[PDB]
Design a protein around this nucleic acid. Structure first.
Lengths: 171, 227, 134, 199, 25
RNA sequence: GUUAUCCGGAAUGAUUGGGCGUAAAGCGUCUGUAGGUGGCUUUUUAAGUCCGCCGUCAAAUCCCAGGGCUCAACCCUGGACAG
């Protein structure tokens, strides 16, 4: 109880935050019908470092930052080899949200649906195109991209895994 | 170096495994033989993984850390405490709480209260209040004495946790896997080598096998402090 | 011994390592022998051994791993058929795909033998794409 | 059209439109209300990169669709090539050479037929220049020294590396297509490119 | 800093849980 | 701007690209004709398949590169992958 949380908020230049949806989810009780706020926060620096997080609380801002503290303990790093794009195409479903990611030329800003585009514009990739096949959901969507960019391999570690010395690569 | 002769384990209760129709078959490229309703653990890969175990324990203390050991079984209850008073490590007495590693903020405040109640227990002002307050302080001090009596000397997380075999402490183990804290533990004949990332598969039916591997790692840690 | 002798080997590979078991026993026909010959030399697997059981020469095949992990092999193998029996696929030396840029290979049946994308792209020949792994 | 309109509105909304319609910074006696408070949808952000581009060059938006279709149609970084097909626009060059103070100034300065290019007059502001061109005045402009007034008040900012201004014989030429670093305006190519993906 | 140290520890252990499940025995 | 017509979005007819325990959906089960797919080795022809060359698929259109109208639209000259 020292006060004002100035040093303790950690001013968040390192991780920039945004919501991607704040739906009010509600439960009914004996007394009636009371609601809490479920916010989904995607945290990440533009270095290649993102992760989702849900939260719910009766306040809006405590749900956002509570989802952020859930989010900033959930980070993967993005395998993004070239001039801020992707090594190869990928698809990976989670639940019932399927996400096709596809690398792009460098003259192409990120084009995807709002959750996928949110976790990629926070991922610092600049050149991708990801269609979403399946759900209208936002959480399983974004988390499906996170699973869809964990399982993604560069050329250096595939060259290391196969044992092949090196060729067949322009750069 | 950290050797153990093959005959010292091969004589005692190390290959003296567990039940022959309870085996969890991720030991199918591991377990050597089966005799009389009891499994027979492969001792070559056992001692090699113990070589690796003492390499990665003595190296980790050579960096300079503090290790943790869980003690809960009541078949190996006090043997861990003997294996933790001399070895300087902090230890679980008899019983575990789900949350002593991952929810350690409330456990930390619970150590504020436990530290203050030990400060009142030592100070001699316990006999001021009548049997009500003394009864309550003895009860909560008894429960924190059950859990937090053996880990007063810890702030923060350890580096390597060595646990009572597999069964009673999947809770503490899964808190370690959530925290990422590497653990090197004991495996029965019917458990997972992939829970922790290196462990030491040997039966723990023998108290002398438990005293063997634990005593081995106790001198590993103390020689880690030897600097 | 079903309908396909190539979904035989391939489905034994997927079903082999999705249960993390690093050992395959399959029949050794000519095209299976050729696939494991052009597959051990490309770093996916470790060893292929012929032997006999009732004078029936089989292939036991050792898969790759790594060390003691959550799963001891990191890169999931991801084998896939293409030219199904009843839907044959055929490619020129134009269509022949660079799988994921090259991180996968497309083993295919030339008039020479069966090659990879390296050994059928330099030839300029084309043929029936058996399957591509990645 | 031209849009020919109130323009500090567009500077307060879009941020400071550099050079175009002002060297004077906005709101010399203004802005003392209207808290944004931080709520702006992302479509508003990409839309403000459209109009940060569209007002800074004075284009019709249909013509900007035309330049995006040519920019996709060419080979290379479409986020950059859009800012090559809108830098070697003629009145942007006459702005950048300081032949006029503002880009409506350059557009009107080329509407009334005061520019010879390679010795031939060009009456149209949307003319796209080439490498190794020649940009001069009119023969009457040594008697009509309006260009010399603009070159008098100009030379705070010098030139980017395509231009070569000759002092009294008033000739400016571009050595090569302008580089991205060379582009004067500061904006994200990806934001604008992404916006037109829908079409 | 503490989180980074923890991560480094985990890496060390995973590598220590990477060197010798291969070979060894 | 509204309306109408068409495509997209629509993986909402699905080869690329869906499903059938309970959401729409497995015949009540079985025999079997036509038809579909099919074990292994060796040999032969090459119908499919692949490679080379050649002919043709008018001109105009689309793509590339030049050129002309003050630019563009449009016009013109040459070239060609596909297939």
């Amino acid at each position: 109880g020292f006060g004002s949380k100035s040093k303790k908020e950690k001013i968040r230049d390192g991780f920039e935050e945004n919501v991607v949806q704040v739906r009010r989810v509600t439960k009914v009780v004996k007394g009636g019908k009371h609601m809490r706020f479920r916010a989904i926060v995607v945290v990440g620096d533009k270095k290649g470092q993102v992760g989702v997080g849900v939260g719910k609380a009766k306040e809006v801002v405590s749900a956002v930052q509570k989802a952020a503290v859930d989010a900033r303990r959930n980070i993967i790093t993005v395998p993004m080899t070239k001039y801020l794009t992707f090594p190869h195409r990928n698809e990976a479903d989670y639940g019932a949200a399927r996400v096709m990611l596809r690398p792009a030329a460098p003259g192409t800003g990120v084009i995807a649906g709002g959750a996928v585009r949110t976790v990629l514009e926070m991922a610092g990739v600049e050149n991708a195109l990801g269609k979403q096949l399946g759900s209208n959901n936002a959480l399983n969507n974004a988390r499906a991209t996170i699973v869809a960019v964990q399982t993604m391999r560069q050329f250096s570690d595939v060259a290391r895994d196969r044992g092949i010395p090196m060729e067949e690569l322009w750069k | 170096y950290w050797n153990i002769n093959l005959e010292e384990m091969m004589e005692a209760g190390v290959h003296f495994g567990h039940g022959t129709r309870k085996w969890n078959p991720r030991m199918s490229p591991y377990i050597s033989a089966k005799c009389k309703g009891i499994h027979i653990i492969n001792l070559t890969r056992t001692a090699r993984f113990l070589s690796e175990a003492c390499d990665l324990v003595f190296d980790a203390s050579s960096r300079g850390k503090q290790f943790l050991i869980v003690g809960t079984k009541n078949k190996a209850a006090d043997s861990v405490a003997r294996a933790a008073i001399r070895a300087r490590c902090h230890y679980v007495n008899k019983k575990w709480l789900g949350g002593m590693l991952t929810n350690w903020s409330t456990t930390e405040t619970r150590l504020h209260k436990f530290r203050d109640l030990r400060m009142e227990q030592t100070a001699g002002r316990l006999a001021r209040l009548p049997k009500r307050d003394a009864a309550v302080v003895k009860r909560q001090l008894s429960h924190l004495q059950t859990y937090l009596g053996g880990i007063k000397y810890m702030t923060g997380l350890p580096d390597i946790v060595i646990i009572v075999d597999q069964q009673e402490e999947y809770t503490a183990l899964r808190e370690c896997i959530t925290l990422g804290i590497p653990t090197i533990c004991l495996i029965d004949t019917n458990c997972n080598p992939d829970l922790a990332d290196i462990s030491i598969p040997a039966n723990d039916d023998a108290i002398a096998s438990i005293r063997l591997i634990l005593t081995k790692l106790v001198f590993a840690i103390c020689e880690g402090r030897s600097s | 011994m079903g309908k396909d002798t190539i979904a035989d080997i391939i489905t034994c590979i997927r079903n082999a390592d999705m249960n993390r078991k690093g050992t395959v026993r399959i029949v050794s026909t000519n095209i299976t022998e050729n696939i494991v010959k052009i597959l051990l030399r490309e770093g996916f697997i470790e060893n292929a051994r012929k032997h006999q059981e009732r004078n029936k020469y089989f292939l036991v095949l050792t898969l790759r791993h790594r060390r003691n992990k959550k799963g001891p092999y990191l890169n999931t193998f991801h084998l896939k058929r293409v030219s199904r029996p009843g839907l044959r696929i055929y490619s020129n030396y134009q269509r022949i795909p660079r799988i994921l840029g090259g991180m996968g290979i497309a083993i295919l049946s030339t008039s020479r033998g069966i090659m990879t994308d390296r050994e059928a792209r330099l030839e300029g020949i084309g043929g029936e794409i058996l399957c591509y792994i990645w | 059209s031209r849009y020919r309109g109130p323009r500090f509105k567009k500077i307060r909304r879009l941020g400071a439109l550099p050079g175009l319609t002002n060297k004077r910074p906005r709101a010399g006696s203004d802005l003392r209300n209207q808290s944004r408070s931080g709520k702006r949808s992302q479509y508003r952000i990409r839309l403000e990169e459209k109009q940060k581009l569209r007002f800074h060059y004075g284009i019709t938006e249909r013509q900007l669709l035309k330049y995006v279709r040519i920019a996709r149609k060419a080979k290379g970084s479409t986020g950059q090539v859009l800012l090559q097909l809108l830098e070697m626009r003629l009145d942007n060059i006459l702005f950048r050479l300081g032949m006029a103070p503002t880009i409506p100034g350059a557009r009107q300065l080329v509407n009334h037929r005061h520019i010879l290019v390679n010795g031939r007059i060009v009456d149209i502001p949307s003319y796209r220049c080439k490498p190794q061109d020649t940009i001069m005045a009119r023969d009457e402009q040594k008697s009509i020294a309006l260009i010399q007034n603009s070159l008098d008040l100009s030379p705070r900012e010098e030139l980017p590396k395509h231009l070569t201004l000759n002092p009294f014989p008033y000739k400016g030429l571009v050595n090569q297509i302008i580089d991205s670093k060379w582009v004067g305006l500061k904006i994200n190519e990806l934001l604008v490119v992404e916006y037109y993906s829908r079409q | 800093t503490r989180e980074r140290q923890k991560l480094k520890q985990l890496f060390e252990d995973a590598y220590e849980r990477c060197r010798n499940a291969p070979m060894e025995g």
